[PDB]
Structure formats: C-alpha cells, structure tokens
C-alpha cells in the first residue's frame, strides 16, 4: 500500500531513471521513445523494477566525436532540419572550441519563438555535452515544429 501522491512522484522518478538509462545506452541511436539486442535492455529494466530535437543533438554529438570542421557540420544539420519541414531552428555550440578561452557560436535558420507557453509547446529542445580533446563542447539544439495553430496569426479568409 502506497498513497496516490507518493505513487505519482515515484512513477515520475522511474520515468526519469529510464530516460537516463536510455541516454547512457543509446549513443548510436535516434533516441526519443519511452514506451514499454533489446532482450538485454528488457532484462535490465526488469531487474530495476520488480523533426525531433534529442535525436538531432545526439547526431551532432556523434559528428563532433568523429572530428569535423564544426561550422560545416552545424550547417548540414540546419539543412537537414529545413528539409524535415521545420518552421525554424536554432543550434548553439559553446565551450573550448579551437581556442582555449570561451567562444559560444549561434546557428539560427528560420524564426524561433522564445517567450510564452507557445515556446513551451511548439519547440522541442535538447542539450548534450560532447566530451572532446581538452574538455567538453556544449550542444544545445532548439527546433520550432510545424504548428495546433500559433496565437499570433489571425488568418482572414
């Protein structure tokens, strides 16, 4: 017997844990999922228990690990996003990056709403920290998805 409040929190915690586990495991995957080769994963979960932004971020991280010219990679990513039908994007990469000191680099394409509950709704955001030569490079990707309609527009027929 466990109370409702207690249960809910516990469930949330479990969800979080699962997510983290997935992140740890699947560096080679276009990960989003969270709905329940894979046999091992299932076993692990049992033991424990008794277009998208995250994927893009992961891809970026992988690219960084591989060792590209950075800017080019970012551009490619942006292009991909555009192809996948995004109204707007934004990527940031801050960290060490070539020089020792500082250096945050923005990469926007289409328009990116930041403030309001629309932002909360109509953007998928993701954050990965790609470990590299002499520290960490800091990805953050932010995608504005196709709307189910924005509050700013007033479409007269």
């Amino acid at each position: 017997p466990i109370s409702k409040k207690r249960k809910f929190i516990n469930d949330g915690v479990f969800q979080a844990e699962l997510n983290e586990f997935l992140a740890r495991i699947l560096a080679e995957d276009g990960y989003s999922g969270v709905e329940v080769r894979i046999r091992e994963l299932t076993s692990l979960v049992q033991k424990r228990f008794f277009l998208c932004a995250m994927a893009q971020a992961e891809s970026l991280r992988y690219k960084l690990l591989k060792g590209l010219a950075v800017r080019r990679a970012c551009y490619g990513v942006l292009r991909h996003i555009m192809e996948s039908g995004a109204k707007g994007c934004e990527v940031i990469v801050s960290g060490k990056l070539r020089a020792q000191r500082a250096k945050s680099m923005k990469f926007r394409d289409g328009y990116l709403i930041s403030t309001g509950e629309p932002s909360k709704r109509f953007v998928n955001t993701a954050t990965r920290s790609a470990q590299l030569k002499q520290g960490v490079l800091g990805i953050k990707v932010k995608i504005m998805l196709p709307t189910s309609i924005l509050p700013d527009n007033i479409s007269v027929l």
């Binding site: 809910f8 929190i9 949330g12 915690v13 969800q15 979080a16 997510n19």
Partner: peptide, 8 residues
C-alpha cells in the same frame, strides 16, 4: 533539471 520528466 529533471522537474520536466517527473511531471512538475
């Protein structure tokens, strides 16, 4: 950080 996933 995890307040989103927990549902807060």
């Amino acid at each position: 950080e995890r307040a989103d996933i927990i549902g807060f």
